[PDB]
mmCIF file of C-alpha atoms in Angstrom:
data_model
loop_
_atom_site.group_PDB
_atom_site.id
_atom_site.type_symbol
_atom_site.label_atom_id
_atom_site.label_comp_id
_atom_site.label_asym_id
_atom_site.label_seq_id
_atom_site.Cartn_x
_atom_site.Cartn_y
_atom_site.Cartn_z
ATOM 1 C CA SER W 7 21.370 18.010 15.296
ATOM 2 C CA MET W 8 17.564 18.947 15.610
ATOM 3 C CA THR W 9 15.027 16.612 14.609
ATOM 4 C CA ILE W 10 11.960 18.461 13.282
ATOM 5 C CA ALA W 11 10.333 17.726 9.858
ATOM 6 C CA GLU W 12 9.733 20.795 7.561
ATOM 7 C CA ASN W 13 6.212 19.391 6.588
ATOM 8 C CA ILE W 14 4.192 16.307 7.367
ATOM 9 C CA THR W 15 5.061 14.617 3.886
ATOM 10 C CA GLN W 16 8.532 14.090 5.490
ATOM 11 C CA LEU W 17 6.986 11.966 8.079
ATOM 12 C CA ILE W 18 5.961 9.236 5.234
ATOM 13 C CA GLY W 19 7.559 5.941 5.676
ATOM 14 C CA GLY W 20 9.755 4.847 8.672
ATOM 15 C CA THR W 21 7.190 2.688 9.805
ATOM 16 C CA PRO W 22 8.003 0.324 13.061
ATOM 17 C CA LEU W 23 7.832 -3.238 12.960
ATOM 18 C CA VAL W 24 5.862 -5.160 15.830
ATOM 19 C CA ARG W 25 5.965 -9.085 16.646
ATOM 20 C CA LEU W 26 2.482 -10.511 16.234
ATOM 21 C CA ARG W 27 2.168 -12.687 19.590
ATOM 22 C CA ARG W 28 -1.263 -14.283 19.581
ATOM 23 C CA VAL W 29 -3.089 -14.331 16.242
ATOM 24 C CA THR W 30 -0.600 -16.576 14.484
ATOM 25 C CA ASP W 31 -1.562 -19.206 17.004
ATOM 26 C CA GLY W 32 1.556 -21.025 17.941
ATOM 27 C CA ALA W 33 3.514 -20.775 14.517
ATOM 28 C CA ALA W 34 7.100 -21.994 14.645
ATOM 29 C CA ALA W 35 8.206 -19.121 12.663
ATOM 30 C CA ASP W 36 8.149 -15.610 13.836
ATOM 31 C CA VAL W 37 5.839 -13.163 12.263
ATOM 32 C CA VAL W 38 6.698 -9.314 12.445
ATOM 33 C CA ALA W 39 4.161 -6.660 11.211
ATOM 34 C CA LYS W 40 5.326 -3.492 9.123
ATOM 35 C CA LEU W 41 2.368 -1.115 10.395
ATOM 36 C CA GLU W 42 1.667 1.499 7.116
ATOM 37 C CA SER W 43 -1.082 2.564 9.308
ATOM 38 C CA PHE W 44 1.287 4.789 10.883
ATOM 39 C CA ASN W 45 1.939 7.116 7.794
ATOM 40 C CA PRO W 46 0.461 9.944 8.179
ATOM 41 C CA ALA W 47 -2.691 9.609 6.318
ATOM 42 C CA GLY W 48 -3.149 6.194 7.399
ATOM 43 C CA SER W 49 -2.015 4.007 4.827
ATOM 44 C CA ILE W 50 0.990 2.386 2.666
ATOM 45 C CA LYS W 51 -0.219 4.663 -0.414
ATOM 46 C CA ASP W 52 1.120 7.717 1.403
ATOM 47 C CA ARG W 53 4.365 6.157 0.059
ATOM 48 C CA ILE W 54 3.089 5.933 -3.737
ATOM 49 C CA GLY W 55 1.412 9.526 -3.555
ATOM 50 C CA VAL W 56 4.420 11.375 -2.504
ATOM 51 C CA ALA W 57 6.740 9.502 -4.702
ATOM 52 C CA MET W 58 4.693 10.412 -7.405
ATOM 53 C CA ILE W 59 4.409 14.208 -6.543
ATOM 54 C CA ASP W 60 7.945 14.243 -5.931
ATOM 55 C CA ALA W 61 9.219 12.989 -9.188
ATOM 56 C CA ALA W 62 6.619 15.494 -11.104
ATOM 57 C CA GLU W 63 8.217 18.495 -9.118
ATOM 58 C CA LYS W 64 11.627 17.020 -10.305
ATOM 59 C CA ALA W 65 10.581 17.002 -13.612
ATOM 60 C CA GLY W 66 9.099 20.214 -13.864
ATOM 61 C CA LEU W 67 5.515 19.076 -14.475
ATOM 62 C CA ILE W 68 4.347 20.758 -11.391
ATOM 63 C CA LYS W 69 4.390 24.157 -10.944
ATOM 64 C CA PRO W 70 3.335 26.349 -7.854
ATOM 65 C CA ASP W 71 -0.176 26.953 -9.448
ATOM 66 C CA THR W 72 -0.786 22.977 -11.115
ATOM 67 C CA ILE W 73 -3.704 21.283 -9.792
ATOM 68 C CA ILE W 74 -3.250 17.637 -8.505
ATOM 69 C CA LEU W 75 -6.399 15.351 -10.636
ATOM 70 C CA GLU W 76 -6.651 11.496 -9.739
ATOM 71 C CA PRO W 77 -9.304 9.032 -10.414
ATOM 72 C CA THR W 78 -9.295 6.853 -7.226
ATOM 73 C CA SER W 79 -11.498 4.043 -5.218
ATOM 74 C CA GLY W 80 -9.857 4.494 -1.676
ATOM 75 C CA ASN W 81 -6.538 5.389 0.291
ATOM 76 C CA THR W 82 -4.410 7.071 -2.855
ATOM 77 C CA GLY W 83 -6.922 9.808 -2.801
ATOM 78 C CA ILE W 84 -6.304 10.451 0.759
ATOM 79 C CA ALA W 85 -2.486 10.530 0.512
ATOM 80 C CA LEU W 86 -2.806 12.787 -2.332
ATOM 81 C CA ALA W 87 -5.231 15.004 -0.670
ATOM 82 C CA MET W 88 -3.005 15.020 2.414
ATOM 83 C CA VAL W 89 0.241 15.815 0.325
ATOM 84 C CA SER W 90 -1.747 18.743 -1.851
ATOM 85 C CA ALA W 91 -2.739 20.242 1.149
ATOM 86 C CA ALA W 92 0.658 20.253 3.081
ATOM 87 C CA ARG W 93 2.408 21.195 -0.442
ATOM 88 C CA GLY W 94 -0.340 24.002 -1.402
ATOM 89 C CA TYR W 95 -1.621 22.471 -4.419
ATOM 90 C CA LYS W 96 -5.312 22.314 -5.162
ATOM 91 C CA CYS W 97 -6.447 18.914 -5.546
ATOM 92 C CA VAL W 98 -9.414 17.462 -7.390
ATOM 93 C CA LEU W 99 -10.277 13.630 -7.091
ATOM 94 C CA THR W 100 -12.811 11.730 -9.339
ATOM 95 C CA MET W 101 -14.363 8.502 -7.923
ATOM 96 C CA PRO W 102 -17.665 6.140 -7.675
ATOM 97 C CA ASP W 103 -20.421 7.177 -5.560
ATOM 98 C CA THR W 104 -20.410 4.215 -3.789
ATOM 99 C CA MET W 105 -17.245 5.802 -1.800
ATOM 100 C CA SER W 106 -18.182 5.616 1.779
ATOM 101 C CA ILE W 107 -19.579 8.851 3.400
ATOM 102 C CA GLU W 108 -16.790 8.735 5.913
ATOM 103 C CA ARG W 109 -14.032 8.449 3.313
ATOM 104 C CA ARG W 110 -15.565 11.519 1.419
ATOM 105 C CA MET W 111 -16.043 13.529 4.844
ATOM 106 C CA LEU W 112 -12.185 12.782 5.571
ATOM 107 C CA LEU W 113 -11.210 13.785 1.791
ATOM 108 C CA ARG W 114 -13.131 17.111 1.757
ATOM 109 C CA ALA W 115 -11.150 17.822 5.214
ATOM 110 C CA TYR W 116 -7.984 17.878 3.762
ATOM 111 C CA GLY W 117 -9.605 20.335 1.141
ATOM 112 C CA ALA W 118 -10.086 17.690 -1.628
ATOM 113 C CA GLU W 119 -12.555 18.539 -4.124
ATOM 114 C CA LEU W 120 -14.634 15.173 -5.062
ATOM 115 C CA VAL W 121 -16.240 14.646 -8.495
ATOM 116 C CA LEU W 122 -18.586 11.799 -7.912
ATOM 117 C CA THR W 123 -19.372 9.095 -10.679
ATOM 118 C CA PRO W 124 -21.471 6.156 -10.880
ATOM 119 C CA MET W 125 -14.088 2.603 -12.337
ATOM 120 C CA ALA W 126 -14.001 3.623 -15.937
ATOM 121 C CA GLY W 127 -16.131 6.319 -15.088
ATOM 122 C CA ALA W 128 -13.762 7.997 -12.764
ATOM 123 C CA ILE W 129 -10.699 7.566 -14.902
ATOM 124 C CA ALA W 130 -12.794 9.059 -17.881
ATOM 125 C CA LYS W 131 -14.124 11.830 -15.966
ATOM 126 C CA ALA W 132 -10.320 12.469 -14.806
ATOM 127 C CA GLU W 133 -8.840 12.278 -18.587
ATOM 128 C CA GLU W 134 -11.805 14.579 -19.743
ATOM 129 C CA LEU W 135 -11.163 17.543 -17.121
ATOM 130 C CA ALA W 136 -7.328 17.169 -18.005
ATOM 131 C CA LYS W 137 -8.212 18.297 -21.563
ATOM 132 C CA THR W 138 -10.274 21.341 -19.915
ATOM 133 C CA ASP W 139 -7.418 23.334 -18.134
ATOM 134 C CA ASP W 140 -3.413 22.778 -18.647
ATOM 135 C CA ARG W 141 -3.166 23.484 -14.715
ATOM 136 C CA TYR W 142 -4.248 19.821 -14.163
ATOM 137 C CA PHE W 143 -1.596 17.203 -13.654
ATOM 138 C CA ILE W 144 -2.481 13.754 -12.996
ATOM 139 C CA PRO W 145 -0.218 11.797 -10.815
ATOM 140 C CA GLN W 146 1.414 8.491 -12.276
ATOM 141 C CA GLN W 147 3.770 5.411 -11.567
ATOM 142 C CA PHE W 148 6.507 6.734 -13.658
ATOM 143 C CA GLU W 149 9.498 4.173 -13.044
ATOM 144 C CA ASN W 150 11.473 2.455 -15.806
ATOM 145 C CA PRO W 151 10.136 -0.912 -16.129
ATOM 146 C CA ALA W 152 13.627 -2.357 -15.281
ATOM 147 C CA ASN W 153 13.599 -0.428 -12.375
ATOM 148 C CA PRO W 154 11.824 -0.987 -8.869
ATOM 149 C CA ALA W 155 9.142 1.416 -7.881
ATOM 150 C CA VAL W 156 10.817 4.139 -5.636
ATOM 151 C CA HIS W 157 8.652 3.720 -2.582
ATOM 152 C CA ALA W 158 9.464 0.007 -2.652
ATOM 153 C CA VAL W 159 12.886 0.824 -2.573
ATOM 154 C CA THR W 160 12.360 2.833 0.735
ATOM 155 C CA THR W 161 10.128 0.362 2.218
ATOM 156 C CA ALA W 162 12.830 -2.463 1.278
ATOM 157 C CA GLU W 163 15.448 -0.747 3.050
ATOM 158 C CA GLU W 164 13.710 -0.133 6.359
ATOM 159 C CA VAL W 165 12.691 -3.822 6.298
ATOM 160 C CA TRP W 166 16.804 -4.512 5.896
ATOM 161 C CA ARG W 167 17.818 -2.085 8.476
ATOM 162 C CA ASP W 168 15.034 -2.902 11.034
ATOM 163 C CA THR W 169 15.670 -6.843 10.734
ATOM 164 C CA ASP W 170 19.411 -6.298 10.803
ATOM 165 C CA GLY W 171 19.548 -8.303 7.396
ATOM 166 C CA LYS W 172 17.486 -11.181 8.617
ATOM 167 C CA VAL W 173 14.019 -10.756 6.964
ATOM 168 C CA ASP W 174 13.490 -14.554 5.391
ATOM 169 C CA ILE W 175 9.915 -13.868 3.834
ATOM 170 C CA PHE W 176 8.202 -10.626 3.118
ATOM 171 C CA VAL W 177 4.687 -10.743 2.809
ATOM 172 C CA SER W 178 2.572 -7.807 0.959
ATOM 173 C CA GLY W 179 -0.584 -7.306 -0.820
ATOM 174 C CA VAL W 180 -0.830 -7.376 -4.586
ATOM 175 C CA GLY W 181 -1.956 -3.941 -5.134
ATOM 176 C CA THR W 182 -0.456 -2.775 -8.040
ATOM 177 C CA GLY W 183 2.504 -4.951 -7.846
ATOM 178 C CA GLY W 184 5.064 -2.146 -7.481
ATOM 179 C CA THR W 185 5.479 -2.663 -3.586
ATOM 180 C CA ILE W 186 5.804 -6.537 -3.602
ATOM 181 C CA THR W 187 8.109 -7.027 -6.922
ATOM 182 C CA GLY W 188 10.313 -4.098 -5.926
ATOM 183 C CA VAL W 189 11.142 -5.280 -2.565
ATOM 184 C CA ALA W 190 11.806 -8.257 -4.118
ATOM 185 C CA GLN W 191 14.024 -6.976 -6.731
ATOM 186 C CA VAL W 192 15.907 -4.813 -3.735
ATOM 187 C CA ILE W 193 16.410 -7.474 -1.159
ATOM 188 C CA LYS W 194 16.682 -10.756 -3.473
ATOM 189 C CA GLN W 195 20.575 -9.828 -4.277
ATOM 190 C CA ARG W 196 21.504 -9.345 -0.654
ATOM 191 C CA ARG W 197 19.442 -12.543 0.728
ATOM 192 C CA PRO W 198 19.224 -15.202 -2.096
ATOM 193 C CA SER W 199 17.252 -16.974 0.231
ATOM 194 C CA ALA W 200 14.473 -14.626 0.989
ATOM 195 C CA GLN W 201 10.862 -15.625 -0.218
ATOM 196 C CA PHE W 202 8.653 -12.956 -1.286
ATOM 197 C CA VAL W 203 4.804 -13.563 -1.138
ATOM 198 C CA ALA W 204 1.748 -11.515 -2.441
ATOM 199 C CA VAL W 205 -1.627 -11.651 -0.681
ATOM 200 C CA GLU W 206 -4.433 -11.429 -3.069
ATOM 201 C CA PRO W 207 -8.197 -10.518 -1.848
ATOM 202 C CA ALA W 208 -10.919 -13.070 -3.050
ATOM 203 C CA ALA W 209 -15.070 -12.948 -2.208
ATOM 204 C CA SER W 210 -16.264 -14.220 1.009
ATOM 205 C CA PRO W 211 -14.658 -17.772 0.562
ATOM 206 C CA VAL W 212 -12.451 -19.009 -2.221
ATOM 207 C CA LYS W 213 -6.605 -21.713 -4.699
ATOM 208 C CA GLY W 214 -4.604 -22.363 -8.053
ATOM 209 C CA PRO W 215 -1.557 -20.147 -9.073
ATOM 210 C CA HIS W 216 -2.604 -17.623 -11.694
ATOM 211 C CA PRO W 217 -2.390 -14.174 -13.513
ATOM 212 C CA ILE W 218 -4.291 -11.113 -12.036
ATOM 213 C CA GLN W 219 -5.440 -8.416 -13.695
ATOM 214 C CA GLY W 220 -4.944 -4.855 -12.514
ATOM 215 C CA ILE W 221 -6.988 -1.758 -12.906
ATOM 216 C CA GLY W 222 -7.624 0.456 -15.776
ATOM 217 C CA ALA W 223 -9.669 1.878 -18.413
ATOM 218 C CA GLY W 224 -11.407 -0.182 -20.771
ATOM 219 C CA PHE W 225 -12.315 -3.858 -20.987
ATOM 220 C CA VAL W 226 -9.153 -5.574 -20.744
ATOM 221 C CA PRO W 227 -6.857 -4.239 -17.951
ATOM 222 C CA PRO W 228 -3.146 -5.108 -18.055
ATOM 223 C CA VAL W 229 -1.984 -7.996 -15.929
ATOM 224 C CA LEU W 230 0.452 -7.266 -13.046
ATOM 225 C CA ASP W 231 3.906 -8.505 -13.670
ATOM 226 C CA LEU W 232 4.693 -10.764 -10.568
ATOM 227 C CA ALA W 233 8.072 -12.335 -11.905
ATOM 228 C CA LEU W 234 10.242 -12.015 -8.519
ATOM 229 C CA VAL W 235 6.920 -13.466 -6.457
ATOM 230 C CA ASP W 236 7.571 -16.970 -4.949
ATOM 231 C CA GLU W 237 4.109 -17.171 -4.253
ATOM 232 C CA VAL W 238 0.703 -15.642 -4.395
ATOM 233 C CA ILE W 239 -1.679 -16.496 -1.541
ATOM 234 C CA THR W 240 -5.525 -15.786 -2.024
ATOM 235 C CA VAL W 241 -7.446 -14.948 1.256
ATOM 236 C CA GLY W 242 -11.372 -14.464 1.024
ATOM 237 C CA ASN W 243 -12.971 -11.780 2.696
ATOM 238 C CA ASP W 244 -14.281 -13.573 5.604
ATOM 239 C CA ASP W 245 -11.184 -14.986 6.592
ATOM 240 C CA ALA W 246 -9.305 -11.546 6.268
ATOM 241 C CA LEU W 247 -12.031 -9.834 8.274
ATOM 242 C CA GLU W 248 -11.689 -12.327 11.080
ATOM 243 C CA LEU W 249 -8.287 -12.045 11.349
ATOM 244 C CA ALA W 250 -8.616 -8.397 11.305
ATOM 245 C CA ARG W 251 -11.022 -8.485 14.181
ATOM 246 C CA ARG W 252 -8.613 -10.763 16.084
ATOM 247 C CA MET W 253 -5.583 -8.116 15.364
ATOM 248 C CA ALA W 254 -7.661 -5.404 17.456
ATOM 249 C CA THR W 255 -8.760 -7.661 20.248
ATOM 250 C CA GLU W 256 -5.864 -9.718 20.640
ATOM 251 C CA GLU W 257 -2.995 -7.498 19.491
ATOM 252 C CA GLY W 258 -4.361 -4.026 20.181
ATOM 253 C CA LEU W 259 -3.657 -3.298 16.712
ATOM 254 C CA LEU W 260 -6.747 -1.879 14.680
ATOM 255 C CA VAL W 261 -6.122 -2.385 11.198
ATOM 256 C CA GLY W 262 -8.173 -2.845 8.085
ATOM 257 C CA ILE W 263 -9.204 -5.910 5.773
ATOM 258 C CA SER W 264 -6.240 -6.027 3.663
ATOM 259 C CA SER W 265 -4.320 -6.127 6.967
ATOM 260 C CA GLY W 266 -6.238 -9.127 8.092
ATOM 261 C CA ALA W 267 -5.567 -10.924 4.528
ATOM 262 C CA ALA W 268 -1.950 -10.577 4.926
ATOM 263 C CA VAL W 269 -1.671 -11.692 8.645
ATOM 264 C CA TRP W 270 -4.019 -15.001 7.225
ATOM 265 C CA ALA W 271 -1.117 -15.535 4.711
ATOM 266 C CA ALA W 272 1.686 -15.070 7.097
ATOM 267 C CA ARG W 273 0.199 -17.274 9.697
ATOM 268 C CA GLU W 274 -0.401 -19.865 6.847
ATOM 269 C CA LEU W 275 3.536 -19.671 5.884
ATOM 270 C CA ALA W 276 4.390 -19.649 9.665
ATOM 271 C CA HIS W 277 3.146 -23.104 10.113
ATOM 272 C CA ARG W 278 4.875 -24.642 7.227
ATOM 273 C CA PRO W 279 7.619 -26.731 8.446
ATOM 274 C CA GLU W 280 10.195 -25.864 6.083
ATOM 275 C CA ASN W 281 9.666 -22.157 7.372
ATOM 276 C CA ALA W 282 10.263 -23.356 11.096
ATOM 277 C CA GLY W 283 12.677 -20.643 12.702
ATOM 278 C CA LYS W 284 12.320 -18.039 9.690
ATOM 279 C CA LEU W 285 11.643 -14.242 10.380
ATOM 280 C CA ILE W 286 8.676 -13.243 8.136
ATOM 281 C CA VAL W 287 7.680 -9.647 7.884
ATOM 282 C CA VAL W 288 4.346 -8.724 6.744
ATOM 283 C CA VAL W 289 3.368 -5.534 5.659
ATOM 284 C CA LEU W 290 -0.183 -4.362 7.225
ATOM 285 C CA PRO W 291 -1.101 -1.459 4.513
ATOM 286 C CA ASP W 292 -4.263 0.174 6.013
ATOM 287 C CA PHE W 293 -6.593 1.373 8.941
ATOM 288 C CA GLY W 294 -9.608 -0.005 10.609
ATOM 289 C CA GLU W 295 -13.145 1.401 9.191
ATOM 290 C CA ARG W 296 -15.454 -1.778 8.948
ATOM 291 C CA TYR W 297 -15.968 -1.715 13.121
#
């Protein structure tokens, strides 16, 4: 009958929907944003990080004295740093030294230790370090290929509940694929009319449907399995950044470049006549920093 989290990791997810009123530029479909910047460490990666740690704890791979180790370039490190601190695990992150000073300081504020490298450097360093001490555990995605990512199911159910089953299009970043394909897997059975659109970043400006390489060690990273995705919209960084700026000044929503890209895609979809009257839910995965 009380509502008190036992720790901050219990406040991951349950992120709100908000209607976008100005940046859609008079679209005939409704666009509503799911604010993943409301997660405790500011991004969608909080969901992925905690799910990996929860699974490892259940499996018995994380003991009280285990050390969490992870190659990262961005928000997944912040997520793991926050979860590790809340749960009392030491946390070591490897990363390229391009990483912004602001991000390094944030990670360090959570108690994480940063092993910086010139990315395969990051990955190779992590794997080398793991050999050095059996206390090291590297969190990884764990789901059977036949199943949706566990964090995607929670995201999906939130979307379903908060739209009372009325979501028509779900728009999210390609990311590692788990989120968009996972939400598609959950919702499609319940809503055969729903469409699932993935958003891909491109350089400044730049068209044709294509496989997309994920991230990994070595020269040939695996391709992302986007089987349940209706469409990929690729968005140039200039367009993404301009919409991110407009979100801050026209909606009071301070969000990142990935969020700007997603909104560009949702606005595009929202102006197609076949989509008139639809409810379009767009994931804004990240916080603002470029400003």
